[PDB]
Amino acid sequence: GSAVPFHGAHQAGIATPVQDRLHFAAFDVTTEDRAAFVALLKEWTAAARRLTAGHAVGEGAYGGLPEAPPDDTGEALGLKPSRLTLTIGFGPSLFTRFGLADLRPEALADLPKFPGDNLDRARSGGDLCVQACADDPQVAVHAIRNLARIGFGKVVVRWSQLGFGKTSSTTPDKQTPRNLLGFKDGTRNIAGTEKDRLDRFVWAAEKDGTPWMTGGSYLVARRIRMHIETWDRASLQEQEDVFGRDKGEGAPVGKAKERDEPFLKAMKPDAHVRLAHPDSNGGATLLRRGYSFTDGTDGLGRLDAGLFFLAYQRDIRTGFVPVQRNLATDALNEYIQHVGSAVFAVPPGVRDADDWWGSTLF
Amino acid sequence: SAVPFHGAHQAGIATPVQDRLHFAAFDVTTEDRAAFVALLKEWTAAARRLTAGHAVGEGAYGGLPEAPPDDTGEALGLKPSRLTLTIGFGPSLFTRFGLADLRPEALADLPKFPGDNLDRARSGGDLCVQACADDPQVAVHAIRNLARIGFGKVVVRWSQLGFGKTSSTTPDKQTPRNLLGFKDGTRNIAGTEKDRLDRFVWAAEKDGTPWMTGGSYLVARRIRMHIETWDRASLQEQEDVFGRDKGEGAPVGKAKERDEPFLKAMKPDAHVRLAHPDSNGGATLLRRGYSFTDGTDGLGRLDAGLFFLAYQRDIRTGFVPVQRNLATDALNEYIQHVGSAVFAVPPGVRDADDWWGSTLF
Numbered sequence: 001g002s003a004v005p006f007h008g009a010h011q012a013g014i015a016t017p018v019q020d021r022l023h024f025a026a027f028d029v030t031t032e033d034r035a036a037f038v039a040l041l042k043e044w045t046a047a048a049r050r051l052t053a054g055h056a057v058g059e060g061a062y063g064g065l066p067e068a069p070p071d072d073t074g075e076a077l078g079l080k081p082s083r084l085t086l087t088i089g090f091g092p093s094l095f096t097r098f099g100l101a102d103l104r105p106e107a108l109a110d111l112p113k114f115p116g117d118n119l120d121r122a123r124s125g126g127d128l129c130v131q132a133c134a135d136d137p138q139v140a141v142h143a144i145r146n147l148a149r150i151g152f153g154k155v156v157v158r159w160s161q162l163g164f165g166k167t168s169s170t171t172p173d174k175q176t177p178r179n180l181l182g183f184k185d186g187t188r189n190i191a192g193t194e195k196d197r198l199d200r201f202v203w204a205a206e207k208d209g210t211p212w213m214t215g216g217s218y219l220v221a222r223r224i225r226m227h228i229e230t231w232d233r234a235s236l237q238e239q240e241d242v243f244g245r246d247k248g249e250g251a252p253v254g255k256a257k258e259r260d261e262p263f264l265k266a267m268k269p270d271a272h273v274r275l276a277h278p279d280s281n282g283g284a285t286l287l288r289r290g291y292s293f294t295d296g297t298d299g300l301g302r303l304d305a306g307l308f309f310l311a312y313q314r315d316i317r318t319g320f321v322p323v324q325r326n327l328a329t330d331a332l333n334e335y336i337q338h339v340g341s342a343v344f345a346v347p348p349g350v351r352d353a354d355d356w357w358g359s360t361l362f
Numbered sequence: 363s364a365v366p367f368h369g370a371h372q373a374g375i376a377t378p379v380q381d382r383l384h385f386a387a388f389d390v391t392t393e394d395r396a397a398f399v400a401l402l403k404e405w406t407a408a409a410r411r412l413t414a415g416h417a418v419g420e421g422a423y424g425g426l427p428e429a430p431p432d433d434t435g436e437a438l439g440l441k442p443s444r445l446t447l448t449i450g451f452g453p454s455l456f457t458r459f460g461l462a463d464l465r466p467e468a469l470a471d472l473p474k475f476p477g478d479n480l481d482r483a484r485s486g487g488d489l490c491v492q493a494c495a496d497d498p499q500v501a502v503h504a505i506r507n508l509a510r511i512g513f514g515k516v517v518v519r520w521s522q523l524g525f526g527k528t529s530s531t532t533p534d535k536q537t538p539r540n541l542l543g544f545k546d547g548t549r550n551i552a553g554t555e556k557d558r559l560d561r562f563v564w565a566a567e568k569d570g571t572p573w574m575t576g577g578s579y580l581v582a583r584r585i586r587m588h589i590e591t592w593d594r595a596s597l598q599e600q601e602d603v604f605g606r607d608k609g610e611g612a613p614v615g616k617a618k619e620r621d622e623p624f625l626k627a628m629k630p631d632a633h634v635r636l637a638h639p640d641s642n643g644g645a646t647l648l649r650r651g652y653s654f655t656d657g658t659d660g661l662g663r664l665d666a667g668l669f670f671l672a673y674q675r676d677i678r679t680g681f682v683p684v685q686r687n688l689a690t691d692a693l694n695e696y697i698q699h700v701g702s703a704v705f706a707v708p709p710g711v712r713d714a715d716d717w718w719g720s721t722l723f
């Protein structure tokens with residue numbers, strides 16, 4: 001129920017331990033006024049300082065002038081901060097505005113078309129995004145709602161996604177959660193304490209060639225539908241072959257414990273873990289931080305389930321792209337379909353109370 | 363950590379309200395009464411396992427490599443999480459299996475109400491399963507596996523996820539707030555008031571339908587909120603709408619949330635004044651609904667609201683009169699009912715040999 005510090009060299013919500021709930025919103029910008037947008041970024045930062053500490057935005061949720069609408073919408077009154085983090089990112093489309101063209105990072109690469117892609121253009125892209133994570137879904141929703149409210153007339157929500165439960169882990173000392181296929185998801189990830197691996201694989205560095213991004217990261221979001229009818233009639237051996245780990249313990253095939261190291265030669269050549277593993281991709285490593293979702297029925301008598309996949313990396317060209325290219329023959333492809341996509345540059349952290357989101361860009 | 367599954371009544375009505383909801387309505391595809399009774403028996407056996415935190419059937423793993431696992435496995439390593447599973451029968455069920463003359467008169471069709479905008483695809487249903495738990499994954503795993511067990515005899519018609527309080531961080535003494543920012547539940551039937559339950563919630567034998575004794579009747583309404591419009595309303599407009607202040611939730615003119623309201627100090631069309639039993643001939647409801655947020659719609663607005671669930675001894679003397687009295691509710695400016703269903707919720711599963719629906723079939 002505690003708070004996660006908001007200030008830092010990096011934004012919270014990446015190496016932070018993975019909270020139970022997600023509310024992710026992508027915003028489109030609707031103002032041409034650079035100064036207006038900078039003022040928005042500063043107002044948003046002030047709101048975020050309150051929200052992550054469990055305080056109401058502005059003058060609060062009541063006790064103001066009767067004839068005026070309250071500053072804070074109020075549905076989080078009395079709740080703890082609940083480990084709320086708020087992480088902002090900038091989409092490639094943003095750099096066509098406010099004369100930012102020359103400032104677009106090289107590592108903010110557009111993704112190529114991948115085989116099997118069925119991307120819904122409505123639930124894709126976006127000028128910027130805010131990832132709200134908390135252990136309380138009301139806390140996460142209240143944050144997105146109030147950021148959207150403050151930005152009325154300068155940004156509009158393009159699409160959003162709620163994740164009802166995590167399918168990732170940055171804390172290998174706690175239980176690994178399971179995705180909706182029933183497998184543990186997050187065993188071999190980067191941990192928030194492996195400072196060296198975060199510097200190597202996650203945080204942009206000055207020498208990478210975009211100085212304002214130093215201390216930030218790059219995010220890939222992929223909305224992935226799961227064919228659960230198909231999966232649920234597959235044999236247990238089939239399910240375990242697809243991944244290369246057994247379902248119960250989550251151990252690599254042939255080994256006894258979840259965290260024993262995989263021996264890749266023992267897995268099928270098209271097993272997911274075998275193809276995604278750093279050793280199969282020249283060392284490419286990702287920080288996965290995704291969440292499961294279900295959005296009702298599919299109108300055909302079935303539950304509609306999926307995984308909202310989020311990966312942070314130092315450079316999209318050396319993280320997500322090579323691994324996803326190596327997944328072209330993945331046995332998992334039979335059971336999933338990518339239906340939404342977006343990339344964002346996640347700027348460095350807000351260094352102190354006089355700093356603000358995006359200060360190093362603007 | 364767990365809630366007993368067996369009892370005179372089904373759990374999940376008078377038992378403590380859990381943090382999360384997964385509500386599913388199903389349509390029946392088989393015409394074979396025997397096949398359906400077999401399914402109800404299999405479902406009950408699975409519900410016994412699920413509510414105790416165990417996998418269904420032979421388990422999620424460790425069986426024949428060439429067989430699909432009995433349980434889909436995404437709840438392995440989780441606790442029971444106070445999971446309750448409550449099943450109900452819709453009016454349309456009674457057109458099958460020769461049951462037409464066993465439909466309770468208290469399971470009334472709802473009239474059309476002013477301002478209804480009901481999505482047919484998210485309304486109705488032959489039966490429902492209300493899955494409540496503190497962990498949303500436990501709830502979803504339950505619905506997912508019951509649907510799989512029933513495949514070929516039932517399909518999912520519509521599904522709704524919801525959330526209330528988060529108990530790890532919030533005291534249970536504390537009234538949760540709905541997404542309009544107001545405390546919600548102050549004057550409600552509590553699970554501890556056994557005589558109020560008997561008077562207002564549980565069906566009695568003399569009520570006219572013996573197989574329903576110890577059951578109850580459920581109304582579900584998916585109520586969208588116009589969030590962005592609400593949020594532009596002055597603080598005084600918001601408080602006038604309900605008849606309670608926003609910070610403390612006290613009735614107008616009083617000091618404490620639990621002060622009994624003075625109805626004449628509220629505006630004539632204030633929500634509490636129109637919903638209160640004194641304005642409806644004593645009609646009193648057990649509310650057990652959940653907030654929802656499904657995402658944002660095509661115009662960028664927040665798809666959010668209250669998945670309203672009311673239990674009552676008779677729909678004709680519970681939900682209908684009160685909802686009727688809300689025709690002029692000042693709240694109507696900010697909400698819209700977009701889904702609706704009613705169900706007969708049968709009595710409880712008495713012991714290890716009983717099953718869901720035994721008194722009806």
Ligand code: HEM
Pocket residue numbers: 179181183184185186187188189222224226243245262272273276277278286307309320323324327336
């Ligand atoms: C529904 C989609 C997916 C599911 C269900 C899934 C599931 C899994 C599972 C069960 C594991 C083994 C446990 C672990 O170490 O985390 C795993 C590992 C991994 N997955 Fe996926 N995955 C999905 C999509 C992806 C995608 C799209 C990528 C990258 C483009 C990816 C990259 C990885 C990586 C890098 C590992 C770690 C392998 C290692 O280093 O040992 N996964 N995934």
Ligand code: HEM
Pocket residue numbers: 540542544545546547548549550585587604606623633634637638639647667668670681684685697
């Ligand atoms: C989004 C829709 C609705 C919202 C936000 C809402 C909210 C509230 C609030 C804030 C209260 C005062 C606190 C409390 O006693 O719980 C209340 C009371 C109540 N509401 Fe609603 N309500 C909604 C719809 C309905 C409907 C559809 C019904 C019945 C058909 C209903 C029946 C009642 C009743 C019976 C009370 C208790 C009044 C009393 O005895 O003091 N509500 N509601």
